[PDB]
Write a protein that binds this ligand. Structure first.
Ligand SMILES: [Cl-]
Ligand SMILES: [Cl-]
Ligand SMILES: [Cl-]
Ligand SMILES: [Cl-]
Ligand SMILES: [Cl-]
Ligand SMILES: [Cl-]
Ligand SMILES: [Cl-]
Ligand SMILES: [Cl-]
Ligand SMILES: [Cl-]
Lengths: 207, 207, 207
């Protein structure tokens, strides 16, 4: 707990955190400390578990990112961080292309190589992972995850906490419900309800 | 119809136009006006339908882009624009990587995150959509469309007006005929004739 | 054989060489000469076959790249180049995003539009082709090839000389053996042994 003045606190110290740390540093931000349920990651000290959050706030740190891949858990930890007085920053790699008409929430991760086009809306705590494409007029719910190299072809709505695996694709105009999982490589050609798993080309719900 | 001096006229005012407008603006270009069959889009005024083109030309506007996703219609409107005295500009996002040995036509859209490698030839009115990859020695016919996140692995020939859906892939050396559609996620491993639909991994013609 | 002082010698004069030449030139490097088994490529002279390597070294050229797509052959030619006193450079397009914690070998090609994330290790003579994504904590063996638009979702190990075709995907944590081929579009969801061919969504070994 001896820390510099002013950087970003990270919740989570795993592989996702490594990537987030590098996005932040590529933008010139400083990462102050990690809190992890196992109480360094790329040189950032792990100072305790989530019980350390009040102490971090008290010492003047007020900016935070939740680097937890699990969508439901990330969402819960973002709420906890905000209750403790932290503001949720975004971690947007400088190579990502984010159109000027995109609406971004808070606590959003946007990895290297991403493109997000016109009039897309990105909810709080979303992850738009490495190389993913979000075409025009998409709506991404809070705490969803578009996995690496996934692609949404415009007018796609993705529900809260939905997860698209590596290389998933969605054709124009499709809606995917909250809490749904699209497997790696799945090609979604019809609306998906909430709380299902869909896999394949074309993607099919698996009971 | 009171317009500034010198910008680009856009045919079409839909979702594709939004993305094109943003590509042009990212390059420092000004978008003058839209003509749309329904007679603003991201702040660009819609001044009429295609019957307004002569009036736009008369007032000194001479640069145009056809922002219409339908390949056959785009091609026809490009001809009409040229007959009315417009030059067809390209709309190439600054993040796109276009090799110095690529040959580009006119009226070409190249979206964010694209890469086009050595000695590829891109016909007039092609769309190389968001995140698409065109490897070395490809030949893209006039008014074709490589959809978002699609990839051509080198030495691929794509016929006039062909359309590759989101995330389609083509292995080296394959030829795809004019007017053919490859569904989203289709993986093309053999030449395709003209005027067919192919879907799947590997892609198969669907009667 | 009259050559400038100081550039890079390229082994191979085919389509892959074209792309490599352009990567090098985009970084401000000069390409001195090609040696090719058939004894110009984008303006670089072909000066002989591999028997010309001693003469090139004698005249002061000492930097080399092996632009041969075949993995086993590339590996053998890299050894031969090093025995002749050449150092193997990397050919990394300036648009590629290579995290600061990535470990790179020598003789590595990294094409336009690539992203490689935290704590990934890239073996000598690997090819990370156009638009490919290598997420955190990956291990790429010597002389492997990640084809255009392929994606590894983190914690993936790729054996020596393995080849992933255009648009292949690998889910987190998977190991792929040496000398294995994943077909274009294959989605690898389980470890693959050495010396197999796997195709499909999900990828399945083909006898
Ligand atoms: Cl830091
Ligand atoms: Cl996030
Ligand atoms: Cl289904
Ligand atoms: Cl404008
Ligand atoms: Cl176009
Ligand atoms: Cl067929
Ligand atoms: Cl040169
Ligand atoms: Cl290489
Ligand atoms: Cl199998």
């Amino acid at each position: 707990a001896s820390l510099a003045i002013g950087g970003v606190v990270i919740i989570g110290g795993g592989g996702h955190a490594k990537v987030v740390i590098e996005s932040l540093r590529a933008c010139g931000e400083t990462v102050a400390a990690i809190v992890d349920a196992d109480p360094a990651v790329l040189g950032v000290p792990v100072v305790g578990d989530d019980l350390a959050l009040p102490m971090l706030r008290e010492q003047g740190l007020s900016r935070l990112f939740v680097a937890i891949g699990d969508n439901r858990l990330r969402q819960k930890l973002g709420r906890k961080a905000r209750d403790h007085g932290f503001s949720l920053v975004n971690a947007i790699h400088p190579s990502a292309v984010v159109s000027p008409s995109v609406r971004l929430g808070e606590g959003v991760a946007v990895m290297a190589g991403v493109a997000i086009n016109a009039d897309s809306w990105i909810g709080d705590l979303a992850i738009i992972n490495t190389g993913a494409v979000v075409d025009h007029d998409c709506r991404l719910g809070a705490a969803c995850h578009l996995g690496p190299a996934s692609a949404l072809a415009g007018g796609v709505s993705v529900g809260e906490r939905a997860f698209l695996g590596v290389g998933a694709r969605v054709i124009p105009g499709v809606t995917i419900g909250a809490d749904t999982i699209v497997g790696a490589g799945g090609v979604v050609v019809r609306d998906l309800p909430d709380s299902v798993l869909a896999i394949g080309v074309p993607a099919k719900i698996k009971g």
